[PDB]
């Protein structure tokens with residue numbers, strides 16, 4: 001394909017004609033909606049599992065654009081749009097008229113005045129053409145700061161996951177920069193990446209030869225083996241290469 | 254007749270090396286209900302329960318990896334999650350951790366308070382796990398209120414869909 005992901009604000013995640021940004025400052029719902037509005041956008045609208053499957057991989061709980069009407073007793077989006085079925089599971093956590101998004105397309109009912117982190121989302125068409133385009137990526141891949149990512153839920157061993165990424169002219173995840181790949185902070189669970197142990201030298205190196213830079217990953221022993229799973233807060237859990245796990249591909253440099 | 258729902262996720266490690274598989278034992282109103290592993294759930298189609306329990310099992314594997322024990326050989330971390338619905342519409346719920354079969358850490362999910370054990374040997378296990386859950390896993394109260402809500406949501410789903418008949 002080699003498509004430029006369409007008009008988005010600078011350093012936003014662009015996926016399938018939709019821009020996204022995750023705000024780690026915890027604000028209440030009203031403050032959070034204002035914050036998205038002040039950036040010419042609004043809170044997360046969830047309209048399709050297919051076009052927004054990036055949201056399957058998100059860690060933790062975040063304010064969403066969904067609101068409850070006392071009179072109706074129905075749930076609607078900030079702009080008045082109806083909540084379609086076959087999208088969200090609304091769960092009764094707290095008494096309140098707002099909802100937190102969480103992965104597996106869940107929505108927890110929360111008190112609107114409780115501080116939480118939040119997700120802004122704006123469509124590519126509603127951002128003007130004089131703005132940031134994310135660098136060349138394949139059609140249906142997540143573009144963030146010109147690097148391209150896709151998350152594969154069909155679980156395979158390390159070697160098969162390499163071949164899988166190879167078949168799409170890509171390689172397994174390579175962490176090279178906490179700044180440029182800070183998106184990886186919000187990934188949930190663990191996933192195969194391209195980091196391999198050389199047993200003789202006792203060293204760690206990437207698929208393409210590159211040696212692991214210092215102060216980039218924390219490596220923990222879990223299962224004895226010569227391969228590493230990525231997990232959140234830049235961790236690298238040592239796992240047996242033959243153990244089937246999920247994986248992350250990325251377009252190479 | 255309080256209706257109850259109880260999950261029992263178990264992970265194992267040999268000589269520090271945490272095994273890839275894990276077994277889940279679910280009890281519904283006291284009676285056995287589901288016996289899962291990573292691959293599938295069997296009733297003693299369950300695709301939602303497989304997806305949910307596997308994600309939990311992965312997280313518990315990482316937890317055990319942060320419990321660096323001197324004792325060699327077999328070690329087991331088990332996390333229990335239980336909730337109830339009484340006749341008067343009030344709820345009970347809790348999260349419990351067993352290491353080698355011995356209870357070392359509990360949380361009342363109604364109040365989000367932790368119960369620490371008596372011996373300082375057991376307190377060492379507890380503060381290891383709590384350090385992991387707070388710093389590495391990065392779990393706020395929200396996580397635990399969601400955990401509470403998830404257990405009650407499933408119990409009400411299993412009652413409403415007619416799985417006690």
Ligand SMILES: *[C@@H]1O[C@H](CO)[C@@H](O[C@@H]2O[C@H](CO)[C@@H](O)[C@H](O)[C@H]2NC(C)=O)[C@H](O)[C@H]1NC(C)=O
Pocket residue numbers: 069072074079080081082
């Ligand atoms: C109660 O629910 C109705 C729908 O049953 C809501 O109607 C929506 O109104 C907004 C106004 O901006 C429109 O954008 C939507 O198109 C309407 N919904 C539908 C499905 O057409 C109504 O907003 C709710 N009541 C109040 C007082 O807000």
Ligand SMILES: *[C@@H]1O[C@H](CO)[C@@H](O[C@@H]2O[C@H](CO)[C@@H](O)[C@H](O)[C@H]2NC(C)=O)[C@H](O)[C@H]1NC(C)=O
Pocket residue numbers: 261263276277278331333351
């Ligand atoms: C969690 O489930 C495991 C099995 O899935 C239980 O382990 C069994 O415990 C009994 C004794 O209570 C033994 O007779 C069995 O041989 C054990 N089986 C295995 C595979 O270890 C365990 O009791 C459950 N944990 C809790 C806290 O109830």
Ligand SMILES: *[C@@H]1O[C@H](CO)[C@@H](O)[C@H](O)[C@H]1NC(C)=O
Pocket residue numbers: 040041126127128
């Ligand atoms: C802001 O949002 C509006 C639609 O709500 C859109 O027309 C406009 O192009 C956006 N950007 C700017 C810079 O106004």
Ligand SMILES: *[C@@H]1O[C@H](CO)[C@@H](O)[C@H](O)[C@H]1NC(C)=O
Pocket residue numbers: 095096097111112113
């Ligand atoms: C949310 O909390 C506030 C106090 O912090 C309370 O006044 C309000 O009624 C709560 N909302 C509910 C119960 O819907």
Ligand SMILES: *[C@@H]1O[C@H](CO)[C@@H](O)[C@H](O)[C@H]1NC(C)=O
Pocket residue numbers: 198200201203211
């Ligand atoms: C360590 O050994 C491996 C395997 O022979 C070799 O490829 C590598 O260049 C060696 N030296 C390093 C990583 O400094």
Ligand SMILES: *[C@@H]1O[C@H](CO)[C@@H](O)[C@H](O)[C@H]1NC(C)=O
Pocket residue numbers: 342
């Ligand atoms: C009992 O509680 C549930 C959920 O907390 C609620 O749906 C139901 O309306 C309550 N029953 C009565 C009689 O109020």
